[PDB]
Amino acid sequence: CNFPEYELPELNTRAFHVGAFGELWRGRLRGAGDLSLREPPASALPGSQAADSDREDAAVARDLDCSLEAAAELRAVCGLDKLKCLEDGEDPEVIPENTDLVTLGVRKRFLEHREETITIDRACRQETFVYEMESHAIGKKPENSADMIEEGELILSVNILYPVIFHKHKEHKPYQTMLVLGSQKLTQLRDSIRCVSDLQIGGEFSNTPDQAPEHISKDLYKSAFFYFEGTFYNDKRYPECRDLSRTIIEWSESHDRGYGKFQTARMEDFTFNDLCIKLGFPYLYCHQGDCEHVIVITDIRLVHHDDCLDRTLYPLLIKKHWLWTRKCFVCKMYTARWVTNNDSFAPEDPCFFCDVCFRMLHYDSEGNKLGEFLAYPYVDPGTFN
Amino acid sequence: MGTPPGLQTDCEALLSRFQETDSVRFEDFTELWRNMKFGTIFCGRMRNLEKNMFTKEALALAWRYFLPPYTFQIRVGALYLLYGLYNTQLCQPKQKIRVALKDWDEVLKFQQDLVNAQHFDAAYIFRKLRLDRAFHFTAMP
Amino acid sequence: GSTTTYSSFRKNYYSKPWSNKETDMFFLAISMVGTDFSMIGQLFPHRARIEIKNKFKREEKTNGWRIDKAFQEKRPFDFDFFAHLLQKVLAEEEKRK
Amino acid sequence: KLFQASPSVPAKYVEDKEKMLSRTMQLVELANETWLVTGRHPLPVITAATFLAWQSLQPADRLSCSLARFCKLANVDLPYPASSRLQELLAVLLRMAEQLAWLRVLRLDKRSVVKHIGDLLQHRQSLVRSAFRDGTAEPALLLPPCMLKSPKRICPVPPVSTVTGDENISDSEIEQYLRTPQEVRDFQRAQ
Amino acid sequence: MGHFMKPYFKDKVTGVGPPANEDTREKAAQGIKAFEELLVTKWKNWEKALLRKSVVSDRLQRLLQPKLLKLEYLHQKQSKVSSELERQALEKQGREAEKEIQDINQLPEEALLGNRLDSHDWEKISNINFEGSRSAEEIRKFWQNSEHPSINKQEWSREEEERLQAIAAAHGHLEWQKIAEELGTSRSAFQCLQKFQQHNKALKRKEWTEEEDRMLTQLVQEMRVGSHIPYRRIVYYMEGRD
Ligand SMILES: [Zn+2]
Ligand SMILES: [Zn+2]
């Protein structure tokens, strides 16, 4: 059955078909309206329930199988005045002293020691990106009707891991997280990814540095594919696309290398609803022939009226990781735009140069090459991340 | 990230001391809530990201006690804990309880049980959370 | 199977090492039976007669004086008593260990 | 099976037969003159020599291997004494290395010496005559291992002797070897 | 779960991934560099000591192995000739190498290293002495430009700093080999440029300009979300920042 469950608890889940999984939600929610994108009334203090009582009490009696007076009694008893230890207007910036929470004692221990001239600041908590992604998109609605999320639509959470692996840590992961819709196709996620590998350039131009190539890798090659549950989804919408799956299968299926048989499909063949996938399981995506991204589905859920309903912002980037820039070795402060080899001036090979240091060190006033070296243009993945 | 710092201690203390009341009414749980002022948890110089994330994690942690194999009374206390956490939060928009597909139908059946048990405070609070749509239809908690 | 069938002398199999209390009991049997390695092998069912001969040969290298001292420390002979002593002392060794 | 690529032996394991066989010949010539082969099974010597020759032809890709880890890839079985011969030869090469300053300066050991034999084998005869203590026509002993342990004492003259075996025998010793009738009946009961 | 990191396809018994595909082949033919080429590791102290040790060993070998070759060849010919006088002459030529091995063994390490531009087998130093962990030309650059004892390694004196700043302008802050040679302190062009740029007012800015402001504003409008921006990655697009 397409019934979610853990395979390794809180790490990865058992497989289910995405479309049947959404229909399994909607068979328990369709008609009830709890999955909708329309604003419902909310709980409040008992003293202002008069306006809402006529609508609320009849429905409460209907669903709880109780009388109107019983519904009113429940609505009065379950008012938020019994729970709001905080009055409407109190700020979150201070720990109230009128509390017995162990959590707030630990929070007191967190906060108070920072109240010193060395530590007074309002800097980041642990990570900066996530709430900025939420705030700028949460609760918005599109300007165009065609860019509106359908009610009850499935929202996946996909972690696209960077090709630059830390190779000193393995618990936490390098990735950027993008939400995608179940009805949308893999082509759109492939197009949305801004990865720097599309911008790769090269060529040796020490004799004529101004002749850097006119084409980025995105203009020369457009190959890309996802890989799920043993199948490839390769893009073939352009003549600059090659089916890398064939090259992969023809080698991987030639021996018991540790992998099963595979199957081939195009990028435009599958919606995310058509997939049968495991959450938390490392899947694969690739483009430009060598830029492999590990794909992890970290979450999948129905859309709700509090979510970002403006589809112009989708695939909705929701988390990211902060790679460092490749700073020039000469000045040790500025980001490099050039890399050289066989350099008679540089102390090491390879040596990374910024545009300012590269040109002045290796050329004269009129730009003629000085010394012995080879140079290549450089686009920094530590910057374009 | 998992259990928020020290939150599990407070949650289990409140739930156990409520269960010791031998009562299922919401009023006793609110008396315990307000005596130790649990609702103050969302203050404490919590910038927005931490506020939202802590709300999410706390609601899932209380979900784990709202689920089986816990008995009726302790599940009712967990439901009251979820109600208090959700309606005392200072988030905008209000963050949600993560509810699994494997849990949603069992929890509707628990709504039916609360209705049939005549302990209508828990049933009304569950329907109030549904009206608030605090429950988020997510694959896992 | 491969042509590189290595061959070496394997008659030196792993035999169980001799215990210290077992050695004391061997000396006691020398005192109370004598050097009848067959009847000793019956008394020590764990040890066959060739092991008894090997024990004699190893002990006589340095502990021949103890062989003589035991042999002169004569005692009445009872098979059942010797068996009970062997099992009881080994069980007590296990319990101590 | 090291002479052509296979899934068991990728290129980093593949090697040319000529080079390794030359190295193994250069090693066995060392083995006998060092008394290593006399009185021993030879195939352990060959196995150790081949394993180390293969390692040192590409040690960066091969110092991570092991005797069994090697032999299983080529479908080969190895002697347990192969390790003994390996220890012997490692000691021999560490003894060899100290004779040259431009090898001594690296402070070689078991881990590092394997990749340097390519340099040692170019001066072997010079190393030997700077290394053996037996400088006679006919610092360390160039003698078979069975004496390299050094005698506890160097075989003083044996005690060739005789005894007067014609003396009267003490009957007490004879009688001690006899069971009493009590012991005879105990034996009967036990039997 | 982390075993799936790159490459996603890795062989169990051999450990290698799939071969170079067509796009990678054409990229390599065009000289388009991969991101794996961007990994650089620091020279640590024991690595520097190992480099000195390897170079001294290499020079000593280069010096002695010809001598040992002469010794062995003359000995071999001495062993086979029956002529007594020729035998003694060959023995004399062997004694030459016999004394030369001893003499060379006693040289000081600096004499072994020799001049900055002396010949070394950088390939052998890389693939044997360093176990291949560092490439031949990389080791050559490091040695001959930073580590060989003849290169200046001292801190910049005040007089040297001011004279560097003064002469850099005459060459238009270009042609830094000429600047280094004119400074007269045996600095390298790279060293001079590094020192100059770490204190150059034209590079490191308290100031701001119209084009820098324009690029900063455009990148901020393009990439900011709420409070977040990539402060230190915007450096690549507008110059003089870090
Ligand atoms: Zn891609
Ligand atoms: Zn920069």
The distance of B46 to chain A (nearest Cα, Å) reads 6
CB spacing of E68 vs D102 below 8 angstroms = no
Contact A196, A379 (CB under 8 A): yes
CB spacing of E65 vs D60 below 8 angstroms = no
CB spacing of A92 vs B131 below 8 angstroms = no
What technique determined this structure? cryo-EM
Strand, coil or helix: what is A230? coil
Q: Which residues pair with A13 in a beta bridge?
A: A6
Ligand nearest to the CA of A382: 2
Distances (CA, A) of D183 to C26, C34, C80: 18, 10, 15
Strand, coil or helix: what is E86? helix
Q: Which amino acid is at E134?
A: R
Q: How many CA atoms lie within 13 A of E180 on its CB side?
A: 17
Contact B95, B56 (CB under 8 A): yes
d(C-alpha D13, C-alpha D1), whole Å: 10
**Nearest residue of chain E to residue A345 (CA atoms):** E190
Centre a 10 Å sphere on the Cβ of residue E80 and count the other Cβ atoms it contains: 8
Closest CA to A306 of B132, B48, B53: B132
What is the 3-class SS of D4-51, one letter each residue? CCCCCCCCCCCCCHHHHHHHHHHHHHHHHHCCCCCCCCHHHHHHHHHH
The pairing of strands A175-181 and A374-377 is unpaired
Contact A200, A378 (CB under 8 A): no
Q: How many CA atoms lie within 13 A of A308 on its CB side?
A: 20
d(C-alpha A291, C-alpha E155), whole Å: 43
Please give the backbone phi and psi of residue B53, each rounded to the nearest 5 degrees, phi first: -65, -45
Contact D141, D92 (CB under 8 A): no
**How many CB pairs below 8 Å do chains C and D form together?**
33
Q: Which amino acid is at A321?
A: H
**Nearest residue of chain E to residue D125 (CA atoms):** E72
Element (H, E) at A374: strand A374-377
CB spacing of B41 vs A130 below 8 angstroms = no
Residue B99 token pair: 């509810």
Contact C72, D176 (CB under 8 A): yes
Virtual CA dihedral for A267, A272, A273, A274, nearest 10 degrees? 30
> Any idea how long chain C is?
97
Cβ-Cβ contacts under 8 Å for A118 (sequence gap 6 or more): none
d(C-alpha E93, C-alpha B138), whole Å: 90
Residue D157 token pair: 């003259």
Contact B36, A104 (CB under 8 A): no
> Any idea how long chain E is?
242
Distance in angstroms between the alpha carbons of the first and the last residue of chain D: 64
8-state DSSP, E146: I
Residue A371 token pair: 């010394």
Closest CA to E118 of E102, E139, E140: E140
Contact D70, D54 (CB under 8 A): yes
DSSP D146-181: HHHT--SS--PPP------TTSPPPHHHHHHTS--H
Centre a 10 Å sphere on the Cβ of residue D37 and count the other Cβ atoms it contains: 16
Contact A182, A273 (CB under 8 A): yes
Question: Assign residue A6 a region: left if phi > 0, alpha if psi is -120 to 50, beta otherwise?
Answer: beta
Q: Which residues pair with A225 in a beta bridge?
A: A234, A286
Contact A209, A354 (CB under 8 A): no
Closest CA to A153 of A340, A339, A331, A304: A304
Virtual CA dihedral for A98, A100, A106, A110, nearest 10 degrees? 0
d(C-alpha D140, C-alpha D130), whole Å: 9
Strand, coil or helix: what is E242? coil
Residues of E whose CB is below 8 A from D102: 57, 60-61, 64
Taking the centre of ligand 2 as the mean of its atom positions, its distance from the CA of residue E235, in whole angstroms, is 4
Residues of C whose CB is below 8 A from D80: 8
Positive or negative, the Cα torsion across A240, A244, A246, A247? positive
Pick from E11, E12, E13, E14 the residue to mutate for testing the D interface (most D CBs within 10 Å): E14
Element (H, E) at D113: helix D110-113
Q: Which amino acid is at E140?
A: R
Element (H, E) at B71: none
Residue B84 token pair: 């208090």
Helical spans, DSSP H, in chain A:
18-26, 50-64, 68-77, 102-112, 129-135, 186-192, 217-220, 244-252, 355-362, 381-384
Contact B139, A300 (CB under 8 A): yes
d(C-alpha A209, C-alpha A368), whole Å: 10
d(C-alpha A48, C-alpha A54), whole Å: 13
Chains D and C touch (3+ CB pairs under 8 A): yes
Cβ-Cβ contacts under 8 Å for E163 (sequence gap 6 or more): E183
Helical spans, DSSP H, in chain E:
22-30, 45-80, 84-105, 109-113, 122-124, 136-142, 158-170, 176-183, 189-197, 210-223
Residue E104 token pair: 């060379």
The distance of A334 to chain E (nearest Cα, Å) reads 5
Residue A287 token pair: 């483009």
d(C-alpha C28, C-alpha C48), whole Å: 18
CA E14 to chain centroid: 33
Residue A257 token pair: 């290398």
Residue C82 token pair: 């010797």
Distances (CA, A) of C82 to C78, C90, D12: 6, 12, 66
Residues of A whose CB is below 8 A from B93: 138-139, 306
| PDB resolution in Å | 4.1
Closest CA to A334 of A383, A369, A381, A373: A383
DSSP A116-157: STTT-----SS-SHHHHHHHTTTT---SSGGGBPPTT-EEEE
Nearest by CB to residue A102, choosing from B6, B93, B132, is B6
Contact A149, A311 (CB under 8 A): yes
d(C-alpha A102, C-alpha A38), whole Å: 38
d(C-alpha A131, C-alpha A15), whole Å: 30
d(C-alpha A353, C-alpha A332), whole Å: 9
Centre a 10 Å sphere on the Cβ of residue A164 and count the other Cβ atoms it contains: 19
Positive or negative, the Cα torsion across A271, A277, A279, A285? negative
Pick from B9, B25, B29, B37 the residue to mutate for testing the A interface (most A CBs within 10 Å): B37
Q: Which amino acid is at A81?
A: D
Ligand nearest to the CA of A354: 2
d(C-alpha A54, C-alpha A39), whole Å: 18
Nearest by CB to residue A294, choosing from E8, E27, E189, is E8
Q: Which amino acid is at D169?
A: I
Residues of A whose CB is below 8 A from B6: 101-103, 105-106
Taking the centre of ligand 1 as the mean of its atom positions, its distance from the CA of residue D138, in whole angstroms, is 77
d(C-alpha A180, C-alpha A272), whole Å: 8
d(C-alpha D169, C-alpha B25), whole Å: 109
Distances (CA, A) of D15 to B14, D54, E69, E200: 72, 7, 28, 56
Cβ-Cβ contacts under 8 Å for C63 (sequence gap 6 or more): none
The distance of A105 to chain E (nearest Cα, Å) reads 30
Closest CA to B41 of B85, B1, B9, B77: B85
CA angle A181/A184/A186 to nearest 5° reads 110
CA B28 to chain centroid: 15
Taking the centre of ligand 2 as the mean of its atom positions, its distance from the CA of residue E236, in whole angstroms, is 3
Element (H, E) at D62: helix D59-62
Question: Assign residue A89 a region: left if phi > 0, alpha if psi is -120 to 50, beta otherwise?
Answer: left
d(C-alpha A264, C-alpha A246), whole Å: 8
Distances (CA, A) of A347 to C29, E17, E123, E142, E182: 85, 34, 18, 5, 20
Residue B26 token pair: 């919401």
Centre a 10 Å sphere on the Cβ of residue E240 and count the other Cβ atoms it contains: 20
Give D165: exposed, middle or buried? Use CB within 10 Å, 0-12, 13-18, 19+: exposed
Q: Which residues pair with A342 in a beta bridge?
A: none
d(C-alpha E59, C-alpha A190), whole Å: 56
Distances (CA, A) of A1 to A9, A276, E17, E232: 19, 12, 35, 50
Residue A22 token pair: 């959404």
Closest CA to A316 of A152, A154, A133: A133
The distance of D9 to chain E (nearest Cα, Å) reads 8
Chains A and B touch (3+ CB pairs under 8 A): yes
Positive or negative, the Cα torsion across A132, A134, A140, A146? positive
8-state DSSP, D140: B
Contact C77, D190 (CB under 8 A): yes
Cβ-Cβ contacts under 8 Å for B5 (sequence gap 6 or more): A103, A106, A107, A110
**C76 touching chain D per CB within 8 A:** yes
Contact B67, A128 (CB under 8 A): no
CB spacing of E34 vs A371 below 8 angstroms = no
> Any idea how long chain A is?
385
Contact A155, A181 (CB under 8 A): yes
Contact A267, A186 (CB under 8 A): yes
Q: Which amino acid is at A133?
A: M
CB spacing of C4 vs D77 below 8 angstroms = yes
Contact A51, B127 (CB under 8 A): no
Q: Which amino acid is at A91?
A: D
Element (H, E) at A316: strand A316-319
CB spacing of A300 vs B5 below 8 angstroms = no
Residue labelled with tokens 């890709």: D61
Show the beta-strand stretches assigned E in A173-282: 175-181, 224-228, 231-234, 263-266, 276-277
Chains A and E touch (3+ CB pairs under 8 A): yes
Contact E170, E127 (CB under 8 A): no
CA angle E72/E78/E84 to nearest 5° reads 160
Contact A315, A179 (CB under 8 A): yes
Q: Which residues pair with A265 in a beta bridge?
A: A233
d(C-alpha E235, C-alpha A384), whole Å: 11
d(C-alpha A325, C-alpha A194), whole Å: 17
**C27 touching chain D per CB within 8 A:** no
Question: Assign residue B47 a region: left if phi > 0, alpha if psi is -120 to 50, beta otherwise?
Answer: beta
